[PDB]
Amino acid sequence: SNPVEEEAEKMTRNSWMMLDGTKTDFHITVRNKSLSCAINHIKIIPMNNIEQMLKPDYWKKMPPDDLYIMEKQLDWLSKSCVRIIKLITFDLELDNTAVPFNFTGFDLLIEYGMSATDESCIYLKKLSIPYEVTLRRTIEV
């Protein structure tokens, strides 16, 4: 019997504008009690790497496709903005969802927040929150 120790450590329809949400909802952040983050998050700012995927999808589309960076990946709608933190909860940052150039291919989003309280060791378990958002077709050419 080989033991170890025990160490204690929903959106709505959006147009093509930019919505900045300051979130103070029921974030768990499952530490012991009164979790001070000690390096706070001010603005998370997603929908940047979705554009940094979408412009190479255009460029990937420019020649014939042979899965150079499109190989079964459904990570457009994932929106995995990893919130890295340092060492009873705290309010979340400003969103700035900022849909000014994004495809109609997605109809959902998620997130992941690194819950961290490190004492001379490596990092810890990590908590993820999804967000369902629909988009409005405001204009076409």
From Swiss-Prot:
It is found in: Golgi apparatus, cis-Golgi network. Present with 259 molecules/cell in log phase SD medium. Part of the multisubunit TRAPP (transport protein particle) II complex composed of BET3, BET5, TRS20, TRS23, TRS31, TRS33, TRS65, TRS120 and TRS130. Interacts directly with TRS65. Belongs to the TRS120 family. Specific subunit of the TRAPP II complex, a highly conserved vesicle tethering complex that functions in the late Golgi as a guanine nucleotide exchanger (GEF) for the Golgi YPT1 GTPase. TRS120 plays a role in the YPT GEF activity of TRAPP II in concert with the two other TRAPP II-specific subunits TRS65 and TRS130. This is Trafficking protein particle complex II-specific subunit 120.
